[PDB]
Amino acid sequence: YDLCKTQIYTEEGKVWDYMACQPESTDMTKYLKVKLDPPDITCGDPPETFCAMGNPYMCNNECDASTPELAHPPELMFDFESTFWQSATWKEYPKPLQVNITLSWSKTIELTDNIVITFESGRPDQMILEKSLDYGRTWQPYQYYATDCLDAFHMDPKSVKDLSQHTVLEIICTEEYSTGYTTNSKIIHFEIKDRFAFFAGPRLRNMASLYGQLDTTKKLRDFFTVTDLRIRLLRPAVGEIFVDELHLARYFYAISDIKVRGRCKCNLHATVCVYDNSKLTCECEHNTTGPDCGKCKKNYQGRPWSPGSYLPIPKGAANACIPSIS
Amino acid sequence: QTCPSVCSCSNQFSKVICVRKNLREVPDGISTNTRLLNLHENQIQIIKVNSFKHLRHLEILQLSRNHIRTIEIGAFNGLANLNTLELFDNRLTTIPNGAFVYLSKLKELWLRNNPIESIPSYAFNRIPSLRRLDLGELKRLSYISEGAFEGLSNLRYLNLAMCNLREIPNLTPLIKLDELDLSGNHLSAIRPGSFQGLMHLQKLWMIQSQIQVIERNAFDNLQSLVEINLAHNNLTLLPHDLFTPLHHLERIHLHHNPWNCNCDILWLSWWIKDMAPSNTACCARCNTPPNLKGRYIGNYFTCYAPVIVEPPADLNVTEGMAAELKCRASTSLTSVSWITPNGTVMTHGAYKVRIAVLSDGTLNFTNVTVQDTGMYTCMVSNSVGNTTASATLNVT
Numbered sequence: 001y002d003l004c005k006t007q008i009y010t011e012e013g014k015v016w017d018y019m020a021c022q023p024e025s026t027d028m029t030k031y032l033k034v035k036l037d038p039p040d041i042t043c044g045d046p047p048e049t050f051c052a053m054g055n056p057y058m059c060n061n062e063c064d065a066s067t068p069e070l071a072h073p074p075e076l077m078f079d080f081e082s083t084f085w086q087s088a089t090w091k092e093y094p095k096p097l098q099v100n101i102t103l104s105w106s107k108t109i110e111l112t113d114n115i116v117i118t119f120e121s122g123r124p125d126q127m128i129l130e131k132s133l134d135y136g137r138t139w140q141p142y143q144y145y146a147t148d149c150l151d152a153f154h155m156d157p158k159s160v161k162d163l164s165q166h167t168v169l170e171i172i173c174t175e176e177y178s179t180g181y182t183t184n185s186k187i188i189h190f191e192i193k194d195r196f197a198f199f200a201g202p203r204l205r206n207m208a209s210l211y212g213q214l215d216t217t218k219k220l221r222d223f224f225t226v227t228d229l230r231i232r233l234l235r236p237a238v239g240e241i242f243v244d245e246l247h248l249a250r251y252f253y254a255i256s257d258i259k260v261r262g263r264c265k266c267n268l269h270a271t272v273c274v275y276d277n278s279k280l281t282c283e284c285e286h287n288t289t290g291p292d293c294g295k296c297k298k299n300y301q302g303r304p305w306s307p308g309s310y311l312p313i314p315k316g317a318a319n320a321c322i323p324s325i326s
Numbered sequence: 327q328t329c330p331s332v333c334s335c336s337n338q339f340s341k342v343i344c345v346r347k348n349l350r351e352v353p354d355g356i357s358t359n360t361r362l363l364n365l366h367e368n369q370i371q372i373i374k375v376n377s378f379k380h381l382r383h384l385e386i387l388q389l390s391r392n393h394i395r396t397i398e399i400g401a402f403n404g405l406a407n408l409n410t411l412e413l414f415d416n417r418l419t420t421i422p423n424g425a426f427v428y429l430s431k432l433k434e435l436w437l438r439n440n441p442i443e444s445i446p447s448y449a450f451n452r453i454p455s456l457r458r459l460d461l462g463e464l465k466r467l468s469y470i471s472e473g474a475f476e477g478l479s480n481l482r483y484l485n486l487a488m489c490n491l492r493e494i495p496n497l498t499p500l501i502k503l504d505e506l507d508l509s510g511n512h513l514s515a516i517r518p519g520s521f522q523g524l525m526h527l528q529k530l531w532m533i534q535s536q537i538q539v540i541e542r543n544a545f546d547n548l549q550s551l552v553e554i555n556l557a558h559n560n561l562t563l564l565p566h567d568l569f570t571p572l573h574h575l576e577r578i579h580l581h582h583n584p585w586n587c588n589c590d591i592l593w594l595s596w597w598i599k600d601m602a603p604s605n606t607a608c609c610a611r612c613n614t615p616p617n618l619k620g621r622y623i624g625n626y627f628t629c630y631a632p633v634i635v636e637p638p639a640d641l642n643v644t645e646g647m648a649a650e651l652k653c654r655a656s657t658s659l660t661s662v663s664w665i666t667p668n669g670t671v672m673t674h675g676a677y678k679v680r681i682a683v684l685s686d687g688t689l690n691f692t693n694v695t696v697q698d699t700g701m702y703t704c705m706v707s708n709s710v711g712n713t714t715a716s717a718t719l720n721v722t
């Protein structure tokens with residue numbers, strides 16, 4: 001799905017054969033714009049002392065914004081990998097330490113791989129992964145993460161493994177990333193490859209089953225499409241319900257790296273995507289126009305607008321804009 | 327006064343930061359005035375003899391997240407004021423015996439996430455001043471000695487988390503021990519013989535230790551215990567009045583366990599209701615039966631009083647011979663306690679000296695005496711009610 005137009009030789013003349021387009025899936029974190037509320041959450045002014053996950057008595061390491069070796073800015077969450085961002089310990093008790101990490105794009109992006117949020121110190125006991133398709137106007141929840149789902153969000157604890165091919169669009173609350181005494185103790189996952197596995201398979205070789213369903217169902221196609229992302233932190237890693245008061249330095253948020261991989265929505269009309277004037281935009285082909293190739297270019301309004309389909313494999317149907325009738 | 331070009335020093339030279347910088351050898355040029363030396367995230371492998379000789383005021387030494395595989399004998403020589411020694415996330419295959427020798431101020435020592443194979447006899451004996459010790463995340467651990475914690479009579483905190491141990495090691499020389507962490511291990515079942523000698527212990531952590539059953543009178547030796555964490559385990563039921571000898575106990579964590587809610591879990595339900603205040607430590611929920619699954623703990627359903635299988639029969643016996651007062655219960659869950667005509671109450675948990683009570687509930691006598699004659703009453707207790715059985719003993 002790399003080529004747009006190819007030199008074709010027909011019985012009557014020689015024109016171009018139009019086929020389905022798709023850009024290369026790359027590390028998207030290079031194109032986002034991070035937003036934090038409260039903006040004063042990043043520790044440094046004044047310098048604070050923190051405690052690592054290992055021991056509660058392990059309080060020697062400190063955070064200071066003035067010194068680059070001790071500074072932890074939000075830029076480190078998208079740094080090539082370990083460097084990590086840190087938030088100020090909740091000194092204001094019992095005020096809930098709520099942090100919102102808005103990952104803005106200002107462009108429609110279809111996800112291809114799992115959203116991996118690798119933490120540095122503890123996994124939050126209350127967390128919501130949110131999405132937006134209307135450029136940050138409204139917010140739709142992707143998945144909820146908590147220690148006790150029935151108490152924290154009033155939902156029954158489920159898992160992606162427990163879901164089915166008919167219940168792919170279902171929003172679930174998982175307890176898989178609650179405990180900190182197993183392997184992957186600092187990793188929070190949003191299973192996208194496992195959600196594709198219901199159609200494609202465990203090996204992900206039969207892509208034809210996945211491609212076919214994406215062309216027919218609009219809701220399934222919209223589920224993986226995002227314009228914005230949000231990490232809604234509610235309660236930090238405390239472990240036990242009874243939280244310490246004398247030592248508030250033990251509790252805070254720390255993220256090592258965020259893995260957001262995907263493709264920009266071209267509606268199967270473009271392969272080239274230019275990051276012009278701090279914004280990623282599609283280099284429209286098949287006589288299309290707009291930011292996501294959602295509109296027909298004027299003078300090419302013969303047949304109504306329709307996005308390209310993957311079927312048949314490999315040369316998919318382009319559904320190009322034909323010239324207007326005189 | 328001296329400052330290395332690689333390291334970022336502070337004014338008056340007390341804190342020497344060497345974090346993020348790549349170093350293969352120990353940096354030379356550290357001032358005597360230094361109280362804190364941070365060498366986190368480095369590539370250092372060998373700690374040479376007299377590397378911290380001139381540093382007499384240094385209290386905290388951070389050698390964490392490095393490639394340290396071997397530590398020499400005279401490596402920690404010259405450090406008189408050293409209190410905290412960070413050695414977590416390294417390449418240490420064995421604990422260096424010649425390293426931790428002459429340290430009088432050392433109170434804290436972290437050694438987690440290291441490929442330590444074996445802990446030998448008389449380890450940490452040369453440093454008895456140690457109050458906190460962390461030997462966590464030892465994935466490559468295969469041997470633990472009997473006298474491994476010998477000499478540590480002043481130690482209060484110990485972390486043996488994620489060491490994948492099946493049985494509790496010899497923690498007897500740790501008299502002053504208050505906090506113990508045995509979370510994330512492969513502990514099969516808690517037996518009464520375990521945890522003995524830990525009279526001063528207050529906090530116990532058994533989070534996700536793969537525990538399936540807790541036997542009767544298991545936590546009886548931990549008298550001064552205040553908090554127990556048994557979260558993320560495969561526990562279905564607990565023995566009746568287990569936390570009864572534990573007078574100083576106040577907080578119990580029992581969440582994320584497949585609890586089989588019935589008549590036998592009523593004593594634990596009332597513990598959360600009255601003994602626990604407005605703030606409850608755990609948010610435990612049922613797994614079986616499916617009609618009660620996911621509901622919070624805390625007598626609507628039908629329950630019955632304890633039933634005695636065989637009542638204690640009146641018997642005529644002479645002095646010298648062995649005497650027995652048979653009293654068996656319908657279920658193994660019920661706690662049996664005998665009441666002597668003297669006034670004293672005898673339980674199963676107590677030491678088997680002359681007069682004893684076994685698992686079945688039978689009162690066994692080794693030698694019959696004159697003072698033993700009178701009226702014996704057996705009280706079988708259950709989470710719902712209590713039932714008594716009278717018996718008369720004849721001594722000739």
Ligand SMILES: [Ca+2]
Binds near residue numbers: 077083256
């Ligand atoms: Ca990073």
